[PDB]
């Protein structure tokens, strides 16, 4: 029952998305997950499953870089979690993101 990660932000760097968060407890690992935004209302009712960012399943820093072709042009949700190896943290706040940008 670890504390949840905080200050979740997305940015763009070259052909990559960069997801940054802040965590105060040292010696932690993180897992980054994503979801289609429309899944919270159309199926809703927990009739969906969160997915993992391809190479951010077990990151060691408070940062995650991943290619932009991980996503299509749409609206996605991102969330982060932490573990000590045994105990897992509550899930971060879900952030919404538009991959098109206009």
């Amino acid at each position, epitope marked *: 029952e670890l504390p949840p990660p905080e200050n979740i932000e997305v940015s763009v760097q070259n052909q990559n998305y960069v997801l940054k968060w802040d965590y105060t407890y040292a010696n932690m690992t993180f897992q980054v997950q994503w979801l289609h935004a429309f899944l919270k209302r159309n*199926p809703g009712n927990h009739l969906y499953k969160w997915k993992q960012i391809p190479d951010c399943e077990n990151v060691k820093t408070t940062q995650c870089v991943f290619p932009q*072709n991980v*996503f299509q042009k749409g609206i996605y949700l991102l969330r982060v979690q932490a573990s000590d190896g045994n105990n897992t943290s509550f899930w971060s706040e879900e952030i919404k993101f538009d991959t098109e940008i206009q």
Partner: antibody
Amino acid sequence: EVQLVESGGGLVQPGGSLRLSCAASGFSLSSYYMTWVRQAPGKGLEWVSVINVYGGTYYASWAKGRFTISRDNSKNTLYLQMNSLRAEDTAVYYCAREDVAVYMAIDLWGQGTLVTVSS
Amino acid sequence: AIQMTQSPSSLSASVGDRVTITCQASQSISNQLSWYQQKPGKAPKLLIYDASSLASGVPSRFSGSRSGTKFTLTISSLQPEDFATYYCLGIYGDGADDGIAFGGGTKVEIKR
């Protein structure tokens, strides 16, 4: 009771155009990722293209130049437009529904239509 | 762009054997690998999703496992009705351009 029924396909001359269609029966077509997958004679499955719920199109590299996926929401129908067809395009073409909610896999196929590109 | 390397291309085995198909991704795709069975003259049938989750109506002899970018489909007791071609399907991220790839397939014939 949901089903995908493709039509079109048949004998088409090299360089010609063709439009495959796929009628979805029993479900709301525009709320799934819909894909075309092809199988050349005696070969494996080959992913051709996908259209998502917002209407964005994504392709395999070799298919992007000559193939166009689309859908008519007023007809509940998916389409694959094929221009400048090659003999190497001769294949069975399958309509296929991708479930992104849970599976992240293909959960429903059409029966396939044969496309023969020959003179 | 992602590629799935499936192995073996074909195999023969007796009724009751334990057979294993392997499929390696060119890069990590998390668990987003599914396994399909194609009988002669029919469309493919979904067997396994998320690397290890059996689809509805699939006998318990089919199982799936992951280890990095190497995925394994296993048939524990091969049956005569299992003659088929098996494909893996890897979807990188949300399957954008060249983000979806089938493996080459594996023909499975029963040795009698």
